[PDB]
Amino acid sequence: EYPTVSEIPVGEVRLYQIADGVWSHIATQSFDGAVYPSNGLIVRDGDELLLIDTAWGAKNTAALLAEIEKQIGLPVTRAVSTHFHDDRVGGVDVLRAAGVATYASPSTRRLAEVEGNEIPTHSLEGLSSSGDAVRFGPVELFYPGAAHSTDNLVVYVPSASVLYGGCAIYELSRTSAGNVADADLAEWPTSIERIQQHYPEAQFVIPGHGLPGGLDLLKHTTNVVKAHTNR
């Protein structure tokens, strides 16, 4: 039963094992009087944890580490932010203070710095060209090309067929485009095509926000992006 926007108060974080040593983390945040859910990933790396993305702010991210310290007991050693916006890097100073090594592509780090946002300390090399893939312990990092943002990465857990799409992939419940202020609408469908062509084997697909599904979430995102383009 995947945790939903309701059963999580803004300030709290729930974990949801997906497979052997793979969790999503689920948080909530208020924007413009509404409440939205947010997903990241946790991947066991021997006796320690890889974190993908913050829980959308300093308070939610301190809760996330406390919820990891109650429920799993292993130390987060590294974190990756999948793009430069506040829902992915907000909480990076909290991670750093606790001893977590924070990572992002040089492009994410430059865009975060221009935007004023928290800047992960470490640089991920070899992701500057669309279709680039690099190994990062128990996951592959993949730059599909510009989509939700010019810098957006996706993460694959070969051991488990878990594709974490971040904010480049929409949940089925989302039937209109969200925040596309920094998006490349022209390149978004091609970038999703590179994800399909690189990861046909994926069996679990986690959007940046809301429910996981199958690879149908890629075709869903393409349908929503194209409808928005033709507004």
Ligand SMILES: COc1ccc(O)c(-c2n[nH]c(=S)n2NCc2ccccc2C(=O)O)c1
């Ligand atoms: C200060 O934090 C914010 C506020 C508003 C925002 O749109 C964001 C944000 N930047 N990048 C993304 S993705 N953000 N969240 C977007 C969002 C949140 C919930 C549901 C759907 C979306 C979406 O626009 O795709 C971050």
Ligand SMILES: [Zn+2]
């Ligand atoms: Zn964003």
Ligand SMILES: [Zn+2]
């Ligand atoms: Zn997002």
Ligand SMILES: [Zn+2]
């Ligand atoms: Zn659809």
